[PDB]
A paper describes a structure:
Formation of this complex catalytic core in the large subunit of [NiFe]-hydrogenase requires accessory proteins encoded by genes designated hypA to hypF in the hyp operon. After delivery of the Fe(CN)2CO complex to the large subunit precursor, nickel is transferred to the precursor with aid of protein HypA and HypB. HypB belongs to the SIMIBI class GTPase with slow intrinsic GTP hydrolysis activity. Many GTPases, including HypB, undergo GTP-induced dimerization and in a recent review, Gasper et al. categorized them as “G proteins activated by nucleotide-dependent dimerization”.
The only structure of HypB available was the MjHypB in complex with GTPγ-S. To better understand the structural mechanism of GTP-dependent dimerization, we have determined the crystal structure of HypB from A. fulgidus (AfHypB) in apo form to 2.3 Å. Each asymmetric unit contains 2 monomers of AfHypB. AfHypB belongs to the SIMIBI class of GTPase and adopts an α/β fold with a seven-stranded beta-sheet sandwiched by 11 α-helices. Electron density of residues 67–82, corresponding to the switch I region, of chain B are missing, indicating that these residues are not ordered. In contrast, we found that symmetry-related AfHypB molecules may restrict the mobility of switch I of chain A, and hence, these residues are well defined in chain A. Besides, the side-chain sulphur atoms of two cysteine residues, Cys-92 and Cys-122, which are part of the CHxnC motif, of apo-AfHypB structure are in 2 Å distance, suggesting the formation of a disulphide bridge between these two residues. In AfHypB, the conserved Asp residue in the NKxD motif is replaced by an Ala residue. We have superimposed the structures of AfHypB and MjHypB, and found that there is a nearby Asp-194 on the G5 loop, away from the G4 motif, that can form a hydrogen bond to the N1 atom of the guanine nucleotide. Modeling suggests that the binding pocket in apo-HypB can accommodate a GDP but is too small to accommodate a GTP as the γ-phosphate will clash with an invariant aspartate residue (Asp-66 in AfHypB) on the G2 loop. First, in the apo-form, Asp-66 on the G2 loop is anchored to Gly-118 and Lys-43 by two hydrogen bonds, which are broken in the GTPγS-bound MjHypB.
Residue numbers in the entry:
A (entry chain A): 11 to 213
B (entry chain B): 9 to 66, 83 to 210
The structure:
């Protein structure tokens, strides 16, 4: 962790020098990190210069979709690690020095990323209701580090037997300071709130 | 899933171990929990009655490379060397988080925690303490001199992991070090 902390500080300073705001977006595979990133690019990509670093394996169609908006994007090679670390992006940040907002998609995992500072400005932790409504209480460590917690695909809550209000309450008990958004991209629920949070951090 | 390959090598590991009669122990705990010391004093005690192989994530050292945990693949390469061992003692990285997801193919899981890590270390790390078969609270004799509520640690562990066995241990006094043997023995 010592070498990570060192590179993490360098990533943070470099991000400060360029005025780029970086968001470490964590969550299990299927939590919907990629779609949220695309939808974001689609909504404010014209007003705001966005970079994307994708640390989950992304399909070809999704790579086309993100790159289609002329947005700078790239797969992060994570090799054998169950999480990103400051070293993985240390040499990549320069290519993104011209972005106002750098969206960093972490590995699909709710455990390993806890202890790794990437040098980011904000941490988001995404969870889908399809993961079970005890997923927050099962993973206190990761939910504690979040500045914003996204409970996702809520319009499927009933269908899957998941209790959204319990997920919200467990999140708040574990992390009293974090903003919490209940989100369903299909129905647009929570999206404006998400965008508003991004505008807040860029201004 | 992303652990698909780890699961594959874990089964393969779980086979080689069984067919060789070798029993493996995943030993987890913080960077100072005292895993190395327990292993030494384990070999010093019953290292004459049974053959003990040792792999250090922190007898041979395992290079974890860029990872924060051991994975089944690191074990798999070196398993042949220990096919003629009664007991295999695997010392995982000094880390209470990463090792949670990673089956190594082992028979038993132990998590060691020093009282010098705080009396809420247990409650802060439910995920790992939940996979333990045995939990070792170590250096207990320093609990008072450091202001750590040992009874709290236990309650937290029992809440999170009822079926797990718990031992209070201090090697400066060989406290609990004997029931640790009673455990291995079985
Ligand atoms: Cl790793």
């Amino acid at each position: 962790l010592a070498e990570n902390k060192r590179l993490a500080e360098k990533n943070r300073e470099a991000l400060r020098e360029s005025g780029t705001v970086a968001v470490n977006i964590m969550g299990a595979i299927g939590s919907g990190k990629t779609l949220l990133i695309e939808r974001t690019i689609e909504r404010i990509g014209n007003e705001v210069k966005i970079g994307a670093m994708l640390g989950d394996v992304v399909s070809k169609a999704d790579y086309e979709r993100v790159r289609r908006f002329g947005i700078k994007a790239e797969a992060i090679s994570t090799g054998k690690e169950c999480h990103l670390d400051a070293h993985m992006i240390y040499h990549r940040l320069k290519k993104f020095s011209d972005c106002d907002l750098l969206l960093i998609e972490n590995v699909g995992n709710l455990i390993c990323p806890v202890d790794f500072d990437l040098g980011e400005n904000y941490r988001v932790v995404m969870v889908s209701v399809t993961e079970g409504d005890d997923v927050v209480e099962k993973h206190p460590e990761i939910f504690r580090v979040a500045d914003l917690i996204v409970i996702n695909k809520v319009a499927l809550a009933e269908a899957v037997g998941a209790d959204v209000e319990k997920m919200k309450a467990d999140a708040k008990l574990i992390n009293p300071r974090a903003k919490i958004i209940e989100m369903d991209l299909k129905t647009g629920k929570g999206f404006e709130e998400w965008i508003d949070f991004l505008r807040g951090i860029l201004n």
